[PDB]
Design a protein around this ligand. Structure first.
Ligand SMILES: O=P(O)(O)O[C@H]1[C@@H](OP(=O)(O)O)[C@@H](OP(=O)(O)O)[C@@H](OP(=O)(O)O)[C@@H](OP(=O)(O)O)[C@H]1OP(=O)(O)O
Ligand SMILES: *[C@@H]1O[C@H](CO)[C@@H](O[C@@H]2O[C@H](CO)[C@@H](O)[C@H](O)[C@H]2NC(C)=O)[C@H](O)[C@H]1NC(C)=O
Ligand SMILES: *[C@@H]1O[C@H](CO)[C@@H](O)[C@H](O)[C@H]1NC(C)=O
Ligand SMILES: *[C@@H]1O[C@H](CO)[C@@H](O)[C@H](O)[C@H]1NC(C)=O
Lengths: 440, 186
């Protein structure tokens, strides 16, 4: 059972079950707008200024390279200049945050996301070069999918090449699923890392490219899309092309990754903030394990000096992560409260919650997560009066969805079992089995 | 000195709202909220910021965020605007059988419904509007005169209310009365 949830007998609804609810809503929308045939691209029907043969996308998709692109030649390949020092999958890599990273508050950037193979997408429009915009009529969509498939293939292959322990087949797939979803948010325009200049340019190009895609849509289809940034169009483009993008990410893998729904992941239906929060807990547990392993020298005052420095190194480093976890917890707490209040008020149409534009799908996801876990919907009885949960906290969410297997002894993400902290607390000053050991 | 988010709220009655009282000071002596509404304070690390969940909002309230600061005591207000559909939408009892040529008065009484500036009352013969006026007074009375004709035999007359909350991004809340089926003779 959940060690961070108050005693409950409610019928549990997992995040994946909500992601499937959003998967169903995504294809219902695309089919009702009848834009699938017009939005689904065929990269073999595109034009590629870098030299690559278009047909390769049909005949030998896993053989495509930097030549099968419309990116400026200075962008040598999608992974060019990304993670030179190779820190991405290093156990203790710090997660950057603040106003310099995201508009949305209390966002922690995954190093895997920081060093992402999207260089081709960044250099599609750069200093005069705009090959993607100069392609023959009716090929912009097809040529765009080519660069998206190339960025996806290179991102997955970069992961297979530099992942910590190649034998961890599940770990590689976990990162490939996160990368797939992150590609989706970049394409959809919902990516949180919006303060980075290169990422700003990538998004500016995506709008310019979608200005042309929309212009080449049929009269009846074109009218169903409104918005300067083409957010609804980009949402439907992703739904129409995400299956191809996923298959491109299996290229060169001796151990291909499974898709839990229709042979594709559900992750790209979970909002980015929640996904990144899950990844944070998983990569903290790796660091907690590394720091716990340094206390092996403390097998026993005296000659326990090597233990005293190991106990304090554990303390100073764990508290560095706890500060990030607190900001993550207190933001999630606010967002869940907003979602629960929306449900108490009767959901959308009955109540418009005050929240950052970036957190609207997060409040919406947690709203359905609340309702499906036993939460009471509908407006209060006084609205239409006639005359005569385990996911309530970020700690509870983590124990339900995140891989915490790497955390040694200190595993509980909440200070208290349901509501001085517990000895099994993840962010404790020292491990509970090393209490007498650290006090030599 | 004292700030409040949101500054203006539109919510259904009996509903809840999340209010954040904040101050310009770092370490204030006093920080709270004056309201007779049931409140649950959400525990946060901030000592100059306090989050409150206000429940059972039955009527228009002005919860006052207060803060005693070294520079001086300051107050901030949020404007809660409550909404609810009419409690009673009904046409005045009228006998079904009416003779051809009669000057028939249809009276509809509308009990409640707020905000009144967004509530309008409609009198219809089937789906055709006869009289549409904004709901004024308690109870709001809408009247129309129909000259009874042979053609209206079997026709259904109804009273409808429209609480249009779409300008502030909500739904248009519709309500219909019990229909009156006219039966003609002569
Ligand atoms: O075509 P409209 O410009 O809408 O004219 C209407 C129409 O009747 P006519 O088609 O005979 O002109 C109405 O009747 P309906 O089409 O809605 O059935 C109405 O009658 P109501 O009393 O049913 O609202 C009324 O006709 P009347 O004088 O018979 O009441 C009036 O036509 P007038 O210009 O002749 O007044
Ligand atoms: C009730 O009706 C009034 C009038 O239509 C609405 O007021 C408008 O609201 C929009 C958005 O807030 C403003 O941009 C307009 O300037 C307002 N017009 C006037 C004349 O005041 C009001 O929002 C409606 N109430 C609700 C709850 O939707
Ligand atoms: C008004 O409409 C709502 C929603 O359809 C309904 O719940 C309520 O009972 C209705 N009230 C009256 C007075 O008809
Ligand atoms: C009036 O309503 C009744 C049902 O209450 C229906 O049988 C009848 O057809 C309606 N009259 C007209 C003119 O549609």
């Amino acid at each position: 059972s959940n060690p961070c949830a108050k005693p409950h007998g409610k019928k549990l609804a997992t995040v994946k079950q909500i992601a499937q609810y959003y998967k169903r809503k995504a294809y219902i929308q695309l089919n009702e707008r009848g834009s699938r045939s017009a939005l689904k691209g065929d990269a073999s029907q595109g034009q590629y200024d870098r030299g690559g043969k278009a047909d390769d996308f049909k005949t030998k998709l896993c053989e495509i390279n930097e030549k099968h692109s419309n990116a400026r030649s200075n962008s040598l390949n999608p992974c060019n200049g990304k993670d030179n020092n190779k820190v991405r999958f290093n156990v203790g890599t710090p997660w950057q945050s603040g106003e310099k990273i995201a508009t949305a508050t209390d966002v922690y950037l995954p190093p895997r996301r920081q060093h992402f193979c999207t260089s081709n997408l960044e250099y599609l429009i750069n200093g005069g070069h705009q090959a993607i915009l100069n392609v023959k009529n009716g090929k912009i969509n097809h040529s765009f999918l080519g660069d998206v498939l190339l960025a996806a293939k290179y991102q997955a292959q970069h992961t297979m090449k530099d992942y910590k322990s190649k034998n961890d087949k599940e770990g590689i797939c976990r990162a490939i699923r996160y990368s797939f979803a992150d590609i989706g948010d970049i394409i959809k325009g919902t990516d949180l890392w919006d303060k980075d200049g290169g990422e700003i340019k990538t998004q500016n190009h995506l709008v310019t490219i979608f200005d042309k895609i929309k212009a080449q849509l049929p009269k009846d289809i074109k009218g169903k899309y409104t918005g300067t940034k083409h957010l609804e169009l980009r949402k439907d483009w992703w739904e129409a092309n995400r299956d191809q993008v996923w298959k491109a990410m299996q290229c060169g893998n001796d151990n291909p990754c499974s898709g839990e729904s229709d042979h594709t992941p559900l992750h790209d239906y979970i909002p980015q903030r929640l996904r990144w929060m899950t990844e944070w807990a998983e990569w903290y547990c790796k660091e907690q394990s590394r720091l716990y392993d340094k206390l092996k020298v403390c097998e026993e005052s005296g000659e326990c000096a090597t233990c005293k420095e190991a106990c304090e190194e554990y303390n100073k480093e764990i508290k560095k992560w706890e500060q990030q976890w607190d900001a993550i917890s207190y933001k999630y707490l606010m967002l869940y409260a907003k979602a629960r209040i929306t449900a108490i008020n009767g959901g959308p149409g009955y109540y418009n919650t005050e929240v950052q534009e970036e957190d609207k799908p997060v409040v919406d996801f947690l709203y359905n997560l609340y309702l499906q876990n036993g939460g009471k919907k509908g407006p209060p009885p006084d609205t239409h009066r006639v005359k005569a949960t385990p996911y309530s906290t970020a700690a509870g969410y983590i124990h339900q969805e995140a891989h915490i297997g790497d955390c040694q002894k200190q595993t509980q993400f909440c200070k208290n079992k349901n509501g001085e902290a517990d000895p099994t607390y993840a962010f404790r000053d020292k491990p509970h089995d090393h209490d007498t050991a650290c006090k030599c | 000195q004292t700030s409040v988010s949101p500054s203006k709220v539109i919510l259904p009655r009996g509903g809840s709202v999340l209010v954040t009282c904040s101050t310009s000071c770092d370490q204030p002596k006093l920080l709270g909220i004056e309201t007779p509404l049931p409140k649950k304070e959400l525990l946060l690390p901030g000592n100059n910021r306090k989050v409150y969940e206000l429940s059972n909002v039955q009527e228009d309230s002005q919860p006052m965020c207060y803060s005693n600061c070294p520079d001086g005591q300051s107050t901030a207000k949020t404007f809660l605007t409550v909404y609810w559909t009419p409690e009673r939408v009904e046409l005045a009892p009228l006998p079904s059988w009416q003779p051809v040529g009669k000057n028939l008065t249809l009276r509809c009484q509308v009990e409640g419904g707020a905000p009144r500036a967004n509530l309008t009352v409609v009198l219809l013969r089937g789906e055709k509007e006869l009289k549409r006026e904004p709901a004024v007074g308690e109870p709001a009375e809408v009247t129309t005169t129909v000259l009874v004709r042979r053609d209206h035999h079997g026709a259904n007359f109804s009273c409808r209310t429209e609480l249009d909350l779409r300008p502030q991004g909500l739904e248009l809340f519709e309500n219909t009365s019990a229909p009156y089926q006219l039966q003609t003779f002569g």
